[PDB]
Amino acid sequence: CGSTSNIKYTVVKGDTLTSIAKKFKSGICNIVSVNKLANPNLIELGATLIIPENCSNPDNKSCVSTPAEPTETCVPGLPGSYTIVSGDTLTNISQDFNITLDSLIAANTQIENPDAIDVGQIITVPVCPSSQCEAVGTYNIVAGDLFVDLAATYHTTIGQIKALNNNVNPSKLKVGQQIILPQDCKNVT
Amino acid sequence: CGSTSNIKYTVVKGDTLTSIAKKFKSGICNIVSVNKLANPNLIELGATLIIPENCSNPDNKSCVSTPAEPTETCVPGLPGSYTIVSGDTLTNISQDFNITLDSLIAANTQIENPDAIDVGQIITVPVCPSSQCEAVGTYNIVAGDLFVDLAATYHTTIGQIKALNNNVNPSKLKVGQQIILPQDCKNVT
Ligand SMILES: CC(=O)N[C@@H]1[C@@H](O)[C@H](O[C@@H]2O[C@H](CO)[C@@H](O[C@@H]3O[C@H](CO)[C@@H](O[C@@H]4O[C@H](CO)[C@@H](O)[C@H](O)[C@H]4NC(C)=O)[C@H](O)[C@H]3NC(C)=O)[C@H](O)[C@H]2NC(C)=O)[C@@H](CO)O[C@@H]1O
Numbered sequence: 121c122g123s124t125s126n127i128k129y130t131v132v133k134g135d136t137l138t139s140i141a142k143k144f145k146s147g148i149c150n151i152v153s154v155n156k157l158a159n160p161n162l163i164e165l166g167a168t169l170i171i172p173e174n175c176s177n178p179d180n181k182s183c184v185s186t187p188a189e190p191t192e193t194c195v196p197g198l199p200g201s202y203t204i205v206s207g208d209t210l211t212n213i214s215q216d217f218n219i220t221l222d223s224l225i226a227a228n229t230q231i232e233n234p235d236a237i238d239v240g241q242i243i244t245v246p247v248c249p250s251s252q253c254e255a256v257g258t259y260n261i262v263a264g265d266l267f268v269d270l271a272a273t274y275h276t277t278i279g280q281i282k283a284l285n286n287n288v289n290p291s292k293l294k295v296g297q298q299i300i301l302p303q304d305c306k307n308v309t
Numbered sequence: 310c311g312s313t314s315n316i317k318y319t320v321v322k323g324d325t326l327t328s329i330a331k332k333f334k335s336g337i338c339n340i341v342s343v344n345k346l347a348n349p350n351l352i353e354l355g356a357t358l359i360i361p362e363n364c365s366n367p368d369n370k371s372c373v374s375t376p377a378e379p380t381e382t383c384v385p386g387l388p389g390s391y392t393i394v395s396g397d398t399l400t401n402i403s404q405d406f407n408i409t410l411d412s413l414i415a416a417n418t419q420i421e422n423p424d425a426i427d428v429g430q431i432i433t434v435p436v437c438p439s440s441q442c443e444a445v446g447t448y449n450i451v452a453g454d455l456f457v458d459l460a461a462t463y464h465t466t467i468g469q470i471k472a473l474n475n476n477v478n479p480s481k482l483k484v485g486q487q488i489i490l491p492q493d494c495k496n497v498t
């Protein structure tokens with residue numbers, strides 16, 4: 121990293137390795153190496169992390185694959201709607217559903233100011249025509265499970281997991297917890 | 310029916326044949342016969358119906374099969390949550406999900422008065438462990454489609470269709486409309 125100092129840092133709410141790397145001008149993957157983190161997406165609330173501060177040589181790329189912006193304008197299979205929870209924005213939610221902000225706004229012309237949405241407000245999620253998820257069912261959380269990783273493994277999206285578990289905070293999952301998990305969501309025909 | 314008079318009646322919001330039969334002391338199936346209704350569950354907003362009033366011989370049973378109270382304490386497959394819309398009660402919603410009011414209250418100990426719930430409030434739906442719906446996907450409404458009938462045909466529940474389409478009023482469906490439809494929801498193993 122060719123850093124000049126290290127801070128020992130307590131992980132707080134909202135943190136990702138991306139936001140921590142930015143705060144301290146470190147690299148995501150430098151923090152992964154130094155702390156022998158098994159999964160770059162998983163850092164625990166209240167854990168301590170040694171952070172190389174002010175790196176000349178930040179490695180933010182070798183260990184993660186950060187997706188391009190969403191380009192699709194619909195989500196395969198489900199759901200018809202999503203309910204807004206604390207901290208959601210339409211930008212946030214369209215990214216989770218892997219669609220453009222634009223497509224989510226277009227599906228929701230009842231919203232006038234796209235920046236003023238209310239906890240408890242229901243929005244339309246634009247579902248691709250002729251599409252489906254192959255199985256939707258119970259899953260028990262195991263140690264280190266995250267919505268972000270479960271989406272990739274089961275070929276669904278963060279948003280679709282959130283919609284099926286709309287009152288579950290992804291940051292407060294417990295080993296053994298039952299969530300509802302959609303699988304293999306795709307266009308059909 | 311051995312009725313004493315007939316009223317010509319305009320179907321309004323909230324009406325079912327059950328509520329109309331009660332208002333006028335008729336029978337569900339007498340109204341079905343007289344008006345040659347193809348489906349006892351389907352009456353259209355603003356349609357006129359001849360109602361035999363004050364029947365001595367009301368037939369409420371021959372043409373419909375009215376389900377017993379729900380006895381199950383969980384819903385197979387999905388969803389983790391449901392958002393409250395105008396006119397919902399926990400009694401209403403537990404019936405749609407084919408579970409006991411009791412089981413729905415027990416899953417929701419954050420609710421203190423079970424009779425004071427708010428438009429936009431999210432509740433937990435108790436999903437049976439080790440359960441699933443086999444496919445969840447798009448369906449286009451055809452003439453005469455109803456959530457009540459679609460549940461039976463596709464082996465799901467009114468509540469599960471509502472949860473996947475939480476901003477759709479079941480009384481305002483249009484031919485060609487795309488909804489999200491779960492199928493073949495059951496316990497597994
Ligand atoms: C490189 C990068 O920036 N990637 C991000 C990626 O991190 C974002 O995903 C979010 O990551 C955060 C941090 O990992 C997740 O929050 C954690 O969630 C887990 C699970 O709920 C929490 O784990 C629990 O921790 C406690 C102790 O705190 C243990 O007792 C529990 O057993 C444990 N549970 C399990 C099942 O292991 C953890 O505390 C949370 N940490 C924080 C700081 O909140 C978050 O869930 C995750 N978000 C999603 C939607 O999955 C991702 C956002 O999409 O973007 C980039 O990929």
Ligand SMILES: CC(=O)N[C@@H]1[C@@H](O)[C@H](O[C@@H]2O[C@H](CO)[C@@H](O[C@@H]3O[C@H](CO)[C@@H](O[C@@H]4O[C@H](CO)[C@@H](O)[C@H](O)[C@H]4NC(C)=O)[C@H](O)[C@H]3NC(C)=O)[C@H](O)[C@H]2NC(C)=O)[C@@H](CO)O[C@@H]1O
Nearest residue numbers: 325326327350351352353354453454456457479480481482
């Ligand atoms: C015997 C008995 O009491 N059974 C009840 C059963 O009726 C309850 O189910 C509810 O029935 C009502 C009345 O049929 C349903 O409301 C109707 O919904 C349809 C579909 O949205 C509306 O049809 C539309 O009507 C307009 C004209 O008004 C047409 O232009 C449209 O093309 C047409 N759409 C389609 C697809 O055909 C109709 O207007 C509504 N009528 C009224 C009075 O609102 C209602 O959806 C239905 N509820 C559910 C959840 O399915 C049932 C409640 O669960 O309990 C008993 O089974």
Ligand SMILES: *[C@@H]1O[C@H](CO)[C@@H](O[C@@H]2O[C@H](CO)[C@@H](O)[C@H](O)[C@H]2NC(C)=O)[C@H](O)[C@H]1NC(C)=O
Nearest residue numbers: 187188189190191192217218219271272276277
């Ligand atoms: C978000 O959407 C895009 C486009 O639909 C996905 O990207 C493609 O996925 C398929 C596999 O199903 C591949 O054939 C393409 O090569 C993928 N890559 C690209 C650059 O389009 C993308 O995976 C989706 N992202 C997430 C996180 O779900």
Ligand SMILES: *[C@@H]1O[C@H](CO)[C@@H](O[C@@H]2O[C@H](CO)[C@@H](O)[C@H](O)[C@H]2NC(C)=O)[C@H](O)[C@H]1NC(C)=O
Nearest residue numbers: 376377378379380381406407408460461465466
């Ligand atoms: C509500 O729940 C009950 C019990 O789970 C269902 O009743 C049974 O369904 C199975 C078929 O899957 C039959 O083997 C039983 O004989 C059924 N009858 C009875 C009286 O239990 C019931 O069908 C569900 N109702 C709805 C409307 O979904």
Ligand SMILES: *[C@@H]1O[C@H](CO)[C@@H](O)[C@H](O)[C@H]1NC(C)=O
Nearest residue numbers: 192193194196248249251307
């Ligand atoms: C799925 O089908 C829709 C409807 O045409 C289309 O817009 C969309 O891009 C398709 N998605 C994928 C991933 O192929």
Ligand SMILES: *[C@@H]1O[C@H](CO)[C@@H](O)[C@H](O)[C@H]1NC(C)=O
Nearest residue numbers: 381382383385437438440496
């Ligand atoms: C499904 O399994 C659950 C979990 O044991 C049980 O309570 C429930 O009654 C079962 N439902 C049916 C329809 O068999």
